[PDB]
Design a protein around this ligand. Structure first.
Ligand SMILES: Nc1nc2c(ncn2[C@@H]2O[C@H](COP(=O)(O)OP(=O)(O)OP(=O)(O)O)C[C@H]2O)c(=O)[nH]1
Ligand SMILES: Nc1nc2c(ncn2[C@@H]2O[C@H](COP(=O)(O)OP(=O)(O)OP(=O)(O)O)C[C@H]2O)c(=O)[nH]1
Ligand SMILES: [Mg+2]
Ligand SMILES: [Mg+2]
Length: 370
């Protein structure tokens, strides 16, 4: 049978090389992130100035709106400009004091932070940067002091101003963040908005929600970051590799949608924690993962953040048809890895395993007899 260890891990031409970004590419994403950060800083500063002038100069609501229409708030729709005008006009002294005193902070969460960001594969897919905006403020036991709509409209202001001023830059509203899509760079940047104490305890990291009936959700991304980094320590460095590969498999099977990265990561560490394996043997390890992955999602995948009320993926008895489509797709993986392994020719093995991870590795000479 064929060994795929070099298919997976060979420098420059192996799968990890096709997935992982170079320093040049990473620096590009950082530069793109910096553009969004600086603009959001500007927007917050512009808003803060008007927030100052409100109580300072006893402004009318109209005077507030007209000032905001000299800033980046210009690019919101009329109702949104009026709404932000009202919010800044009528924010309480305590909330106003916080807003004026503190600048927003920026910290990246997700795969760009714990190094699992893959290159995109299908034409529509994009590299994903999760850069959160954090506002220091009084955070009571019940909720943050500053209204969630205000902060969300300031994020929208930033991204919509970037959209309006740049071609290829398109704003998209998600449930948990504002997203700016940069077509020319095959990159989009997710901007979740957070409220945090100004005095960071994870029990006070509040995420501002954009859809539904709940305004805030206590969700510290640091918890997932800490959990995954500790998992890499516990299981071994090959965890990032096998997580990258599974995400690559997901990107190959789904142009859009499919199981989330977090659920994939959690399922993999659950397997690798439970089952004895050889980290150095990526061929066997990936085969182990593929075999057991559907049963993990059948068992249900609980969030590594215990504060979450719902699991990342329900138990089988709670699976809807969309869940089943995912699991049945997962069941297909193990068969692909074994057919490749038992392919009669070397070029046949490559084409077969590339049905799982997509045509990225093209060098059949990486495949060696076991
Ligand atoms: N608690 C919790 N946190 C989530 C969930 N989904 C995303 N997050 C937070 O958002 C961060 C980024 O999420 P994703 O963009 O979907 O995954 P990723 O790690 O960045 O991988 P990818 O390259 O595919 O973007 C990681 C995690 O802290 C979730 O369902 N529950
Ligand atoms: N902190 C935190 N961020 C999340 C969570 N879920 C999603 N996000 C942010 O939203 C981004 C994509 O959101 P989706 O909507 O799931 O697409 C990725 C991540 O940065 C979460 O549960 N907690
Ligand atoms: Mg991400
Ligand atoms: Mg994202």
């Amino acid at each position: 049978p064929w060994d795929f260890n070099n298919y997976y891990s060979h420098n420059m031409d192996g799968l990890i090389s096709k997935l992982k970004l170079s320093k040049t590419e990473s620096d590009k994403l950082k530069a793109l992130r910096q553009i969004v950060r600086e603009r959001t800083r500007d927007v917050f500063q512009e808003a803060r100035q008007v927030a100052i002038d409100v109580r300072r100069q006893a402004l009318t609501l109209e005077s507030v709106r007209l000032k905001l229409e000299k800033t980046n708030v210009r690019y919101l729709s009329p109702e949104e400009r009026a709404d932000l005008a009202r919010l800044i006009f009528e924010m309480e002294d305590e909330a106003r004091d916080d807003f004026i005193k503190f600048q927003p902070r920026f910290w990246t969460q997700g795969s760009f932070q714990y190094d699992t960001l893959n290159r995109p594969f299908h034409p529509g897919q994009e590299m994903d940067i999760d850069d959160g905006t954090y506002m220091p403020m009084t955070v009571f036991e019940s909720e943050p002091s500053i209204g969630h709509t205000l902060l969300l409209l300031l994020v929208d202001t930033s991204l919509k101003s970037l959209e309006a001023e740049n071609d290829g830059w398109v704003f998209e509203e998600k449930n948990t963040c504002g997203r700016i899509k940069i077509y020319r760079e095959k990159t989009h940047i997710d901007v979740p908005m957070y409220a945090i104490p100004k005095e960071v305890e994870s029990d006070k990291v509040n995420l501002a929600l954009r859809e539904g009936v709940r305004r805030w959700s206590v969700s510290d991304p640091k918890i997932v970051e800490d959990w995954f980094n500790e998992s890499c320590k516990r299981i071994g460095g090959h965890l990032r590799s096998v997580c990258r590969f599974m995400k690559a498999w997901r990107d190959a099977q789904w142009e859009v949608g499919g199981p989330s990265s977090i659920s994939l990561m959690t399922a993999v560490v659950n397997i690798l924690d439970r089952e004895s394996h050889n980290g150095s043997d990526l061929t066997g390890t990936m085969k182990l993962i593929a075999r057991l992955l559907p049963e993990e999602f059948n068992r249900g995948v609980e969030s590594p953040d215990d504060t979450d009320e719902k699991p990342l993926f329900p138990a089988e008895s709670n699976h809807n048809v969309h869940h089943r489509a995912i699991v049945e797709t997962m069941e297909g993986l193990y068969g692909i890895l074994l057919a490749a392994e038992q392919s009669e020719s070397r070029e046949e093995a490559l084409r077969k395993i590339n049905e799982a991870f997509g045509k990225r590795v093209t060098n059949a000479l990486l495949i060696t007899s076991s």
